[PDB]
Amino acid sequence: LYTPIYDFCHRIREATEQRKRFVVVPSTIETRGCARVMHDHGLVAGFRDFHNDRAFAVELKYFQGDSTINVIEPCSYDGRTEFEWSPKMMRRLLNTHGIHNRLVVYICRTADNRIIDHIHAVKENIGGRGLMMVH
Amino acid sequence: NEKYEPWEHMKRMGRLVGTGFYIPPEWYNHFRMFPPINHNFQTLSPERVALRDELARKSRLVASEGMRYYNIFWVRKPLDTMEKEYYELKRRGVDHGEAIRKVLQGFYSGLAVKKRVAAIQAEEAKLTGRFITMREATVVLGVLAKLHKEQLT
Amino acid sequence: LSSGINLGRLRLAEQFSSMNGWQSKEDPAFDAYVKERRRKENYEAFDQRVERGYAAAAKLHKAEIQNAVKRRLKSSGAKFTAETLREMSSAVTERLAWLRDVWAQIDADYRSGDSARQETAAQEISAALRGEPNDYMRWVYETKRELRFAGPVGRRAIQEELQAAELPEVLDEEVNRYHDLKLNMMEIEREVKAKYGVAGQQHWAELQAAKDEEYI
Amino acid sequence: SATRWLPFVSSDLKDYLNRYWAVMFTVGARPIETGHIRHYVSWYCTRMKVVLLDHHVYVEPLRQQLQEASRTPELPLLFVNKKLVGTLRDVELLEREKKLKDVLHFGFEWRVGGSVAATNGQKSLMGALPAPYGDAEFFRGRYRGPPVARPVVSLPTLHPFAL
Amino acid sequence: INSGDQSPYRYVEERLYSKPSRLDREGVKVNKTYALQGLGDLEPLRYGANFGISEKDALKYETVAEKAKYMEPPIPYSSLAARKLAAGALWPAAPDPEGMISKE
Amino acid sequence: LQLKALAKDNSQLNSLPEAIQLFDQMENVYGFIASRPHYDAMMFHLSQSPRPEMRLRCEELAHKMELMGIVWNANTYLNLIRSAQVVGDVAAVEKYLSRMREEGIPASIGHLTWAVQAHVQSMIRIDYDALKEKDESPLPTWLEHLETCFGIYELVVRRGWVMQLPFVNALLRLTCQATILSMERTPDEAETIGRFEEQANKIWNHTFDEWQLQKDVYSYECYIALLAHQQRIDEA
Amino acid sequence: DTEFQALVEFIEGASYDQLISGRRFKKVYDVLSENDDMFIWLCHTAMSVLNPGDMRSRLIYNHLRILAESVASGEMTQRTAFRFFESAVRSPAYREIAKRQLEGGAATRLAGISAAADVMRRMGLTRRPMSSYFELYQRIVERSEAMTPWGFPPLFQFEERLSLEPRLKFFSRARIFWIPPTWNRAGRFLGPHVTLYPGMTPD
């Protein structure tokens, strides 16, 4: 649609409701890194054709009838305005609503073009451009 | 509506049992071991055909409009002779259209020979007056019956 | 994947697909399995009325054990975990094995051929089918409460008398469920009118006089 | 939507059966027998494809293939669920035996023995159990049933195609 | 059936398919016995006991959209449905075709 | 192979829920039907967790295995004994050993090793506070648990079986755990701790060299735990 | 026995008031039809068309057996059980197994429903110990779920929606169905509160 992160969230959100096995999402630099972070946290069962620089398939994860991915939303909710997260924002996302948040995964892209979740960003005291959230 | 679903009902029963103040029925644990079934996550060779088409289209015109001969008998032997002469000329690989020309010339000569032997046998059967074909016997058995039907009326 | 397990499942489905492939004297492995299952069922089966009475008694005993676990968890206030479910299932399985061991005797008396044995077996079957509880369970509950509330000499005497008698493993919650039930007025009234005559009528009149006196 | 609309046509009978649920091949010179099947199928709310063989481009292929599926050369012919239903004598027989509902909706005919047309009140067995040793005729004091009436003369019909 | 100064067809129609009749079948305490009491396999399948439509559950909804939203799906099969399947009474028989005869 | 690797994976903490989710993904999403290797690799991993829900999952998996036309074998009874031994339930292990000889399946050595380990975990999970309320010593229960396993050790040398290393390791674990529990619960009974240490040193010094066995990481682990509970830091 | 008791009450009432009334026949029609044997016969005639050698059909068989045993125990209500049954029936695996049993010719569904009647006798899934065989005879000699070629009662609620769309002519093409209130004259007592059904007229 507007953004490859927006399309990457929209296709997974519309294919997890239809109970499909593979979602073909367009492969960019910030897309396959978000997919790798989601695969590390256990929200994605696997991938197909991951070395393709155009599009790759996400093999979704299901457990006892319903989908593992419940809510997946991009940071640019309108598709146009982007945001730059400070490390203060990453520490806010790690401790949100007065608890310790390792449940909801917030993903950013650093200045070194490495796609890093909100836990490892607080671990080395960095920020980045926020891409999407998923839990 | 998906709000009434066996997976949703099993999830509701599981989170009802997980409080510790609800006792599970037998079908809950028996459906954990046997889950409900889900609907999701589930002749002739053509060159010989073209050859027989071309040979039939070129032989129909020489037999129907060319020779004006409709009582030809046992056409399968000269047609398969046309096929085998075509394969004999395709062994050496001479041409395509000229092989059809020589095959049609041989087929025309064979049809002329068959017409001439049929005419010779018919002429010798008609000159002596001793031999009668089966069609003449059928036609006299019909026309004597019709003469007897004239006698009946 | 064409392996041994997959080809075995494929030829099993091919054998059991139609009717022709699995009848008698056709496949020796399936005939051996059916022969062993019929040999097992030849010794461990009952008469059909004995099976119905065993089913009714098994339903009653399973409900009583589940009610005992409910009473324990309601008194303690604890939660129902998988450990309590495992304990309840083991107790139900042990009680059903003991009920099979009991009803084997009733099936033996029902198929013996004697008039008195078949009459008592028919009485047991009719008492089980109507839903009437057994007197043996009442005696077991009474002697368990007596064993609970006795001193050490009486406890050792009861435990040495009944060590070889095949008693079922009865929880304390079953004895507490039996003991804390209120008694029926109509059954005691009928029993005091049957055991005693007009003196029973005068005694019940005095009892109702005390009842309507305590009402005022 | 994604494709421009186009009339379906085929030279083979198998492409008509695999496409539609209920196919009927009629002629324009037979309007009564066509309209009777139009009344029966639309009564059960079944989608139907009527193929008029008048002014068709594959009449001679289709007249040969309809002779192989149905041995009678009578039109119209009803085809439901890639099977042959038949002519008006076959459609009215299923309507009389109350079989036309499950033929048009679910594509099968009931193989249950016994007739359901001659029923009174509730439908039960009512003596359908097998009698010992047979001989239901030799008991002459049996229950013959209620007395039935028969007309002495045939009344004039409203239309010759009323039925 | 006692008529009572009415046509018997319309009287049986009002006693079978009206709203107080089916509400008396569900149990409302209507005036006096608006539905038929004793019916076997001649009872309509809409008002069966094992059916999935109950008007007492539907009286708390004031809109048809709330009835389409909140109510459970109806029970497909019942014993009366089995008797109507054995009798072939799930769909009425087709009448005489009035499309092409006349309008007399 | 993935479930076999996850059964022994100690790199992360989430090996058991990953194995549960992988089994669910294989059955529900991939559409594969679990055969005996899948059930064995899943029950061997579920038999290691002493939580009652995982034990219930192992029992339900064994019941679904026997219901789907897959008979129980020595590995299935071994996984059931492994699931019952970790909670200290000797009654369930004895019921499995009695059921195993009913169908003609012979008991191997490892069933007796995990029966000895069931005796170990039953000595572990005695509620000693209720015995302190009753003023009852837990000493005859420890002597019965020792006598039963030494009767098993006398049984395995009478049948002519080749002596295995985990059986002697289970006996050493039993004696060292009995010594640790005697030091923890009855510290004033020095002769009981002395007899338990004598049996432990007899197993550690002479029994391994009797059957020509070589000590391994578990045999050193049990003796190091014994020497660490005795605060003998230099010997450990 | 409550059914024989209700029959005794019916005979005593019909001898008392000397006519066949509507109250007593409705009472004994409610007593004689309280049994859940209909749904157990649905589950068992769905189990009959399966394959004893295929593992998928073994899963479907054990699922429907557990469903019928939970219905007969009273632990599961009828509506959620019907949802479970129609979810198990509408699956393409069960329909493919039913198609294979149709393509066989020497089908094992008759022995299936016979063993189903024997199981319903043995496990106590009936009201009388010999009523399951008469119910088997009723399923065989009448139009029922046993004579359907796929093993379920032929209603459209037990058939798939993508097969429901090209056959039937419903309200609009290209759940609970209602008449919209634009029809001010539909019937005599027909209105927006009167539901309609796709493949049957329950009126």
PDB file of N, CA and C in Angstrom, chain E residues 10 13-14 17-18 22 33 37-41 44-46 51-53 64 67-68 71-80 83 85-86 88-92, chain G residues 22-23 25-26 29 33 38 42 78-79 82-83 86 138 142-145 153-155 157-158 176 178 188-189 192-203:
ATOM      1  N   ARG E  10     -59.466 -20.609   8.705  1.00  0.00           N
ATOM      2  CA  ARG E  10     -58.860 -19.453   9.356  1.00  0.00           C
ATOM      3  C   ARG E  10     -58.750 -19.645  10.863  1.00  0.00           C
ATOM      4  N   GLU E  13     -55.764 -21.813  11.289  1.00  0.00           N
ATOM      5  CA  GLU E  13     -54.605 -20.984  10.955  1.00  0.00           C
ATOM      6  C   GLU E  13     -54.227 -20.051  12.102  1.00  0.00           C
ATOM      7  N   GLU E  14     -55.223 -19.416  12.727  1.00  0.00           N
ATOM      8  CA  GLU E  14     -54.963 -18.556  13.875  1.00  0.00           C
ATOM      9  C   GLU E  14     -54.525 -19.361  15.094  1.00  0.00           C
ATOM     10  N   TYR E  17     -50.512 -20.714  13.669  1.00  0.00           N
ATOM     11  CA  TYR E  17     -49.382 -19.908  13.225  1.00  0.00           C
ATOM     12  C   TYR E  17     -49.401 -18.474  13.740  1.00  0.00           C
ATOM     13  N   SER E  18     -50.297 -18.135  14.660  1.00  0.00           N
ATOM     14  CA  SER E  18     -50.274 -16.785  15.198  1.00  0.00           C
ATOM     15  C   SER E  18     -49.239 -16.670  16.312  1.00  0.00           C
ATOM     16  N   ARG E  22     -47.827 -19.510  19.347  1.00  0.00           N
ATOM     17  CA  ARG E  22     -46.461 -19.967  19.575  1.00  0.00           C
ATOM     18  C   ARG E  22     -45.918 -19.472  20.911  1.00  0.00           C
ATOM     19  N   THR E  33     -55.623 -20.840  25.921  1.00  0.00           N
ATOM     20  CA  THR E  33     -55.228 -21.976  25.073  1.00  0.00           C
ATOM     21  C   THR E  33     -55.261 -21.643  23.576  1.00  0.00           C
ATOM     22  N   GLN E  37     -53.153 -28.375  21.672  1.00  0.00           N
ATOM     23  CA  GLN E  37     -52.407 -29.146  22.660  1.00  0.00           C
ATOM     24  C   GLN E  37     -51.851 -30.432  22.062  1.00  0.00           C
ATOM     25  N   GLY E  38     -52.732 -31.325  21.620  1.00  0.00           N
ATOM     26  CA  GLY E  38     -52.304 -32.654  21.234  1.00  0.00           C
ATOM     27  C   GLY E  38     -52.071 -32.830  19.751  1.00  0.00           C
ATOM     28  N   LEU E  39     -50.802 -32.807  19.354  1.00  0.00           N
ATOM     29  CA  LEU E  39     -50.400 -33.043  17.977  1.00  0.00           C
ATOM     30  C   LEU E  39     -49.141 -33.894  17.985  1.00  0.00           C
ATOM     31  N   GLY E  40     -49.112 -34.903  17.122  1.00  0.00           N
ATOM     32  CA  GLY E  40     -47.974 -35.797  17.058  1.00  0.00           C
ATOM     33  C   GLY E  40     -46.985 -35.364  16.000  1.00  0.00           C
ATOM     34  N   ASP E  41     -46.911 -36.117  14.905  1.00  0.00           N
ATOM     35  CA  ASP E  41     -46.071 -35.738  13.778  1.00  0.00           C
ATOM     36  C   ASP E  41     -46.704 -34.662  12.904  1.00  0.00           C
ATOM     37  N   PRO E  44     -46.089 -28.544  13.513  1.00  0.00           N
ATOM     38  CA  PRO E  44     -45.079 -27.864  12.693  1.00  0.00           C
ATOM     39  C   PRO E  44     -43.712 -27.880  13.360  1.00  0.00           C
ATOM     40  N   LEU E  45     -42.673 -28.000  12.530  1.00  0.00           N
ATOM     41  CA  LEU E  45     -41.305 -28.117  13.024  1.00  0.00           C
ATOM     42  C   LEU E  45     -40.769 -26.796  13.570  1.00  0.00           C
ATOM     43  N   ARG E  46     -41.428 -25.674  13.261  1.00  0.00           N
ATOM     44  CA  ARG E  46     -41.034 -24.384  13.819  1.00  0.00           C
ATOM     45  C   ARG E  46     -41.227 -24.331  15.328  1.00  0.00           C
ATOM     46  N   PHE E  51     -36.328 -27.794  18.888  1.00  0.00           N
ATOM     47  CA  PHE E  51     -35.890 -26.821  17.901  1.00  0.00           C
ATOM     48  C   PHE E  51     -35.120 -25.689  18.575  1.00  0.00           C
ATOM     49  N   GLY E  52     -34.363 -24.953  17.767  1.00  0.00           N
ATOM     50  CA  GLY E  52     -33.476 -23.924  18.260  1.00  0.00           C
ATOM     51  C   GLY E  52     -34.023 -22.514  18.265  1.00  0.00           C
ATOM     52  N   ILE E  53     -35.328 -22.336  18.090  1.00  0.00           N
ATOM     53  CA  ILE E  53     -35.955 -21.019  18.113  1.00  0.00           C
ATOM     54  C   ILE E  53     -36.954 -20.995  19.259  1.00  0.00           C
ATOM     55  N   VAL E  64     -35.115  -6.477  15.249  1.00  0.00           N
ATOM     56  CA  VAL E  64     -34.795  -7.694  14.507  1.00  0.00           C
ATOM     57  C   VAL E  64     -33.287  -7.846  14.340  1.00  0.00           C
ATOM     58  N   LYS E  67     -32.002  -9.565  17.346  1.00  0.00           N
ATOM     59  CA  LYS E  67     -32.292 -10.993  17.261  1.00  0.00           C
ATOM     60  C   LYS E  67     -31.326 -11.698  16.319  1.00  0.00           C
ATOM     61  N   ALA E  68     -30.946 -11.037  15.222  1.00  0.00           N
ATOM     62  CA  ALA E  68     -29.978 -11.634  14.310  1.00  0.00           C
ATOM     63  C   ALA E  68     -28.570 -11.619  14.894  1.00  0.00           C
ATOM     64  N   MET E  71     -28.820 -13.961  19.162  1.00  0.00           N
ATOM     65  CA  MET E  71     -29.402 -15.283  19.347  1.00  0.00           C
ATOM     66  C   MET E  71     -28.480 -16.379  18.826  1.00  0.00           C
ATOM     67  N   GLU E  72     -28.606 -17.557  19.434  1.00  0.00           N
ATOM     68  CA  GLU E  72     -27.838 -18.723  19.039  1.00  0.00           C
ATOM     69  C   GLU E  72     -28.327 -19.247  17.689  1.00  0.00           C
ATOM     70  N   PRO E  73     -27.487 -19.995  16.964  1.00  0.00           N
ATOM     71  CA  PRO E  73     -27.967 -20.653  15.750  1.00  0.00           C
ATOM     72  C   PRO E  73     -28.978 -21.731  16.089  1.00  0.00           C
ATOM     73  N   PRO E  74     -29.960 -21.967  15.220  1.00  0.00           N
ATOM     74  CA  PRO E  74     -31.007 -22.937  15.547  1.00  0.00           C
ATOM     75  C   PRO E  74     -30.510 -24.368  15.423  1.00  0.00           C
ATOM     76  N   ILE E  75     -31.148 -25.253  16.182  1.00  0.00           N
ATOM     77  CA  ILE E  75     -30.826 -26.676  16.170  1.00  0.00           C
ATOM     78  C   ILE E  75     -31.295 -27.262  14.845  1.00  0.00           C
ATOM     79  N   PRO E  76     -30.410 -27.909  14.081  1.00  0.00           N
ATOM     80  CA  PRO E  76     -30.809 -28.364  12.739  1.00  0.00           C
ATOM     81  C   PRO E  76     -31.724 -29.573  12.754  1.00  0.00           C
ATOM     82  N   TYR E  77     -31.410 -30.584  13.557  1.00  0.00           N
ATOM     83  CA  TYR E  77     -32.083 -31.872  13.493  1.00  0.00           C
ATOM     84  C   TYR E  77     -32.769 -32.177  14.816  1.00  0.00           C
ATOM     85  N   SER E  78     -33.944 -32.797  14.731  1.00  0.00           N
ATOM     86  CA  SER E  78     -34.709 -33.201  15.900  1.00  0.00           C
ATOM     87  C   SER E  78     -35.435 -34.501  15.583  1.00  0.00           C
ATOM     88  N   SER E  79     -36.220 -34.982  16.549  1.00  0.00           N
ATOM     89  CA  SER E  79     -37.000 -36.195  16.325  1.00  0.00           C
ATOM     90  C   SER E  79     -38.172 -35.930  15.388  1.00  0.00           C
ATOM     91  N   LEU E  80     -38.824 -34.774  15.541  1.00  0.00           N
ATOM     92  CA  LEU E  80     -39.881 -34.382  14.616  1.00  0.00           C
ATOM     93  C   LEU E  80     -39.325 -34.102  13.226  1.00  0.00           C
ATOM     94  N   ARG E  83     -38.978 -37.480  11.719  1.00  0.00           N
ATOM     95  CA  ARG E  83     -40.256 -38.012  11.254  1.00  0.00           C
ATOM     96  C   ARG E  83     -40.717 -37.317   9.977  1.00  0.00           C
ATOM     97  N   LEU E  85     -38.610 -36.107   7.793  1.00  0.00           N
ATOM     98  CA  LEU E  85     -37.714 -36.636   6.771  1.00  0.00           C
ATOM     99  C   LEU E  85     -38.170 -38.012   6.303  1.00  0.00           C
ATOM    100  N   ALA E  86     -38.617 -38.857   7.237  1.00  0.00           N
ATOM    101  CA  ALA E  86     -39.130 -40.172   6.866  1.00  0.00           C
ATOM    102  C   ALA E  86     -40.454 -40.071   6.119  1.00  0.00           C
ATOM    103  N   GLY E  88     -41.135 -37.353   4.233  1.00  0.00           N
ATOM    104  CA  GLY E  88     -40.925 -36.480   3.094  1.00  0.00           C
ATOM    105  C   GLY E  88     -41.663 -35.166   3.183  1.00  0.00           C
ATOM    106  N   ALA E  89     -41.861 -34.643   4.393  1.00  0.00           N
ATOM    107  CA  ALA E  89     -42.628 -33.426   4.610  1.00  0.00           C
ATOM    108  C   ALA E  89     -41.746 -32.216   4.897  1.00  0.00           C
ATOM    109  N   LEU E  90     -40.463 -32.279   4.537  1.00  0.00           N
ATOM    110  CA  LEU E  90     -39.583 -31.130   4.709  1.00  0.00           C
ATOM    111  C   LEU E  90     -39.846 -30.039   3.681  1.00  0.00           C
ATOM    112  N   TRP E  91     -40.431 -30.388   2.536  1.00  0.00           N
ATOM    113  CA  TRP E  91     -40.796 -29.446   1.495  1.00  0.00           C
ATOM    114  C   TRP E  91     -42.169 -29.854   0.981  1.00  0.00           C
ATOM    115  N   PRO E  92     -43.056 -28.896   0.721  1.00  0.00           N
ATOM    116  CA  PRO E  92     -44.385 -29.247   0.211  1.00  0.00           C
ATOM    117  C   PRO E  92     -44.322 -29.757  -1.219  1.00  0.00           C
TER     118      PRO E  92
ATOM    119  N   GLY G  22     -56.231 -33.696  24.340  1.00  0.00           N
ATOM    120  CA  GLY G  22     -55.003 -33.138  23.816  1.00  0.00           C
ATOM    121  C   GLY G  22     -53.903 -33.032  24.852  1.00  0.00           C
ATOM    122  N   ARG G  23     -54.283 -32.953  26.129  1.00  0.00           N
ATOM    123  CA  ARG G  23     -53.297 -32.794  27.193  1.00  0.00           C
ATOM    124  C   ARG G  23     -52.517 -34.084  27.425  1.00  0.00           C
ATOM    125  N   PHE G  25     -52.128 -36.809  25.476  1.00  0.00           N
ATOM    126  CA  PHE G  25     -51.305 -37.232  24.349  1.00  0.00           C
ATOM    127  C   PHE G  25     -50.076 -36.348  24.192  1.00  0.00           C
ATOM    128  N   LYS G  26     -50.195 -35.054  24.502  1.00  0.00           N
ATOM    129  CA  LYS G  26     -49.027 -34.179  24.508  1.00  0.00           C
ATOM    130  C   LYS G  26     -48.059 -34.561  25.621  1.00  0.00           C
ATOM    131  N   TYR G  29     -46.371 -37.733  24.490  1.00  0.00           N
ATOM    132  CA  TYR G  29     -45.467 -37.428  23.389  1.00  0.00           C
ATOM    133  C   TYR G  29     -44.212 -36.730  23.893  1.00  0.00           C
ATOM    134  N   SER G  33     -40.360 -38.896  23.954  1.00  0.00           N
ATOM    135  CA  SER G  33     -39.382 -38.257  23.082  1.00  0.00           C
ATOM    136  C   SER G  33     -38.363 -37.436  23.867  1.00  0.00           C
ATOM    137  N   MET G  38     -31.425 -39.901  19.210  1.00  0.00           N
ATOM    138  CA  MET G  38     -31.348 -39.372  17.852  1.00  0.00           C
ATOM    139  C   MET G  38     -29.945 -38.868  17.536  1.00  0.00           C
ATOM    140  N   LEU G  42     -27.043 -40.207  15.077  1.00  0.00           N
ATOM    141  CA  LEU G  42     -26.367 -39.338  14.112  1.00  0.00           C
ATOM    142  C   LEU G  42     -24.856 -39.539  14.152  1.00  0.00           C
ATOM    143  N   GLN G  78     -26.989 -29.990  23.991  1.00  0.00           N
ATOM    144  CA  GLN G  78     -27.296 -30.457  22.642  1.00  0.00           C
ATOM    145  C   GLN G  78     -26.796 -29.498  21.566  1.00  0.00           C
ATOM    146  N   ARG G  79     -26.830 -28.189  21.831  1.00  0.00           N
ATOM    147  CA  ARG G  79     -26.519 -27.213  20.789  1.00  0.00           C
ATOM    148  C   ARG G  79     -25.025 -27.175  20.481  1.00  0.00           C
ATOM    149  N   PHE G  82     -24.208 -30.260  18.610  1.00  0.00           N
ATOM    150  CA  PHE G  82     -24.561 -30.135  17.200  1.00  0.00           C
ATOM    151  C   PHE G  82     -23.531 -29.305  16.448  1.00  0.00           C
ATOM    152  N   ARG G  83     -22.967 -28.289  17.108  1.00  0.00           N
ATOM    153  CA  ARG G  83     -21.885 -27.509  16.504  1.00  0.00           C
ATOM    154  C   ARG G  83     -20.642 -28.366  16.279  1.00  0.00           C
ATOM    155  N   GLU G  86     -21.510 -30.865  13.323  1.00  0.00           N
ATOM    156  CA  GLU G  86     -21.487 -30.259  11.999  1.00  0.00           C
ATOM    157  C   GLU G  86     -20.107 -29.727  11.635  1.00  0.00           C
ATOM    158  N   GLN G 138     -35.539 -49.054  12.061  1.00  0.00           N
ATOM    159  CA  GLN G 138     -36.194 -47.814  11.655  1.00  0.00           C
ATOM    160  C   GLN G 138     -35.287 -46.966  10.769  1.00  0.00           C
ATOM    161  N   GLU G 142     -36.641 -46.886   6.604  1.00  0.00           N
ATOM    162  CA  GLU G 142     -37.235 -45.583   6.341  1.00  0.00           C
ATOM    163  C   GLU G 142     -36.189 -44.626   5.784  1.00  0.00           C
ATOM    164  N   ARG G 143     -36.672 -43.496   5.270  1.00  0.00           N
ATOM    165  CA  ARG G 143     -35.796 -42.416   4.829  1.00  0.00           C
ATOM    166  C   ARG G 143     -35.169 -41.762   6.051  1.00  0.00           C
ATOM    167  N   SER G 144     -33.858 -41.906   6.201  1.00  0.00           N
ATOM    168  CA  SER G 144     -33.181 -41.401   7.384  1.00  0.00           C
ATOM    169  C   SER G 144     -31.731 -41.100   7.033  1.00  0.00           C
ATOM    170  N   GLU G 145     -30.920 -40.917   8.073  1.00  0.00           N
ATOM    171  CA  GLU G 145     -29.505 -40.616   7.919  1.00  0.00           C
ATOM    172  C   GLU G 145     -28.700 -41.817   7.443  1.00  0.00           C
ATOM    173  N   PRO G 153     -27.756 -36.630   8.142  1.00  0.00           N
ATOM    174  CA  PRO G 153     -29.076 -36.212   7.649  1.00  0.00           C
ATOM    175  C   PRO G 153     -28.946 -35.112   6.612  1.00  0.00           C
ATOM    176  N   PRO G 154     -29.760 -35.152   5.554  1.00  0.00           N
ATOM    177  CA  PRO G 154     -29.427 -34.412   4.328  1.00  0.00           C
ATOM    178  C   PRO G 154     -29.681 -32.911   4.361  1.00  0.00           C
ATOM    179  N   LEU G 155     -29.854 -32.314   5.539  1.00  0.00           N
ATOM    180  CA  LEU G 155     -30.105 -30.883   5.650  1.00  0.00           C
ATOM    181  C   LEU G 155     -28.901 -30.070   5.176  1.00  0.00           C
ATOM    182  N   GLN G 157     -27.583 -27.556   6.609  1.00  0.00           N
ATOM    183  CA  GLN G 157     -26.695 -27.150   7.689  1.00  0.00           C
ATOM    184  C   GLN G 157     -25.514 -28.098   7.848  1.00  0.00           C
ATOM    185  N   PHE G 158     -25.615 -29.315   7.318  1.00  0.00           N
ATOM    186  CA  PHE G 158     -24.540 -30.295   7.368  1.00  0.00           C
ATOM    187  C   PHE G 158     -23.798 -30.413   6.044  1.00  0.00           C
ATOM    188  N   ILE G 176     -28.436 -17.187  10.863  1.00  0.00           N
ATOM    189  CA  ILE G 176     -29.882 -17.079  11.016  1.00  0.00           C
ATOM    190  C   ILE G 176     -30.427 -16.170   9.922  1.00  0.00           C
ATOM    191  N   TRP G 178     -33.604 -14.144   8.027  1.00  0.00           N
ATOM    192  CA  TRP G 178     -34.813 -13.428   8.404  1.00  0.00           C
ATOM    193  C   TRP G 178     -35.450 -12.805   7.171  1.00  0.00           C
ATOM    194  N   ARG G 188     -50.300 -14.515   5.811  1.00  0.00           N
ATOM    195  CA  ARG G 188     -51.284 -14.076   6.792  1.00  0.00           C
ATOM    196  C   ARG G 188     -50.619 -13.737   8.119  1.00  0.00           C
ATOM    197  N   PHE G 189     -49.800 -14.643   8.648  1.00  0.00           N
ATOM    198  CA  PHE G 189     -49.085 -14.399   9.893  1.00  0.00           C
ATOM    199  C   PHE G 189     -47.581 -14.287   9.692  1.00  0.00           C
ATOM    200  N   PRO G 192     -41.465  -9.971   9.835  1.00  0.00           N
ATOM    201  CA  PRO G 192     -40.006  -9.928  10.016  1.00  0.00           C
ATOM    202  C   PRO G 192     -39.508 -10.790  11.161  1.00  0.00           C
ATOM    203  N   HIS G 193     -40.364 -11.138  12.117  1.00  0.00           N
ATOM    204  CA  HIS G 193     -39.986 -11.999  13.230  1.00  0.00           C
ATOM    205  C   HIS G 193     -40.078 -13.480  12.890  1.00  0.00           C
ATOM    206  N   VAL G 194     -40.499 -13.823  11.677  1.00  0.00           N
ATOM    207  CA  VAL G 194     -40.607 -15.206  11.234  1.00  0.00           C
ATOM    208  C   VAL G 194     -39.357 -15.549  10.440  1.00  0.00           C
ATOM    209  N   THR G 195     -38.564 -16.483  10.956  1.00  0.00           N
ATOM    210  CA  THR G 195     -37.337 -16.885  10.289  1.00  0.00           C
ATOM    211  C   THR G 195     -37.639 -17.831   9.136  1.00  0.00           C
ATOM    212  N   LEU G 196     -36.758 -17.821   8.142  1.00  0.00           N
ATOM    213  CA  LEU G 196     -36.833 -18.743   7.021  1.00  0.00           C
ATOM    214  C   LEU G 196     -35.577 -19.601   6.981  1.00  0.00           C
ATOM    215  N   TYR G 197     -35.693 -20.748   6.325  1.00  0.00           N
ATOM    216  CA  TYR G 197     -34.633 -21.737   6.281  1.00  0.00           C
ATOM    217  C   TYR G 197     -34.344 -22.115   4.837  1.00  0.00           C
ATOM    218  N   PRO G 198     -33.064 -22.382   4.497  1.00  0.00           N
ATOM    219  CA  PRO G 198     -32.687 -22.552   3.084  1.00  0.00           C
ATOM    220  C   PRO G 198     -33.262 -23.785   2.399  1.00  0.00           C
ATOM    221  N   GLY G 199     -33.086 -24.967   2.987  1.00  0.00           N
ATOM    222  CA  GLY G 199     -33.479 -26.200   2.338  1.00  0.00           C
ATOM    223  C   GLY G 199     -34.681 -26.912   2.910  1.00  0.00           C
ATOM    224  N   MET G 200     -35.483 -26.258   3.746  1.00  0.00           N
ATOM    225  CA  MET G 200     -36.649 -26.898   4.333  1.00  0.00           C
ATOM    226  C   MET G 200     -37.679 -25.838   4.685  1.00  0.00           C
ATOM    227  N   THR G 201     -38.942 -26.256   4.718  1.00  0.00           N
ATOM    228  CA  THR G 201     -40.025 -25.421   5.225  1.00  0.00           C
ATOM    229  C   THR G 201     -40.533 -26.043   6.517  1.00  0.00           C
ATOM    230  N   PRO G 202     -40.105 -25.557   7.686  1.00  0.00           N
ATOM    231  CA  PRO G 202     -40.523 -26.182   8.951  1.00  0.00           C
ATOM    232  C   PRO G 202     -41.957 -25.876   9.358  1.00  0.00           C
ATOM    233  N   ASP G 203     -42.670 -25.034   8.618  1.00  0.00           N
ATOM    234  CA  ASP G 203     -44.058 -24.714   8.919  1.00  0.00           C
ATOM    235  C   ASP G 203     -44.979 -25.896   8.632  1.00  0.00           C
TER     236      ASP G 203
END
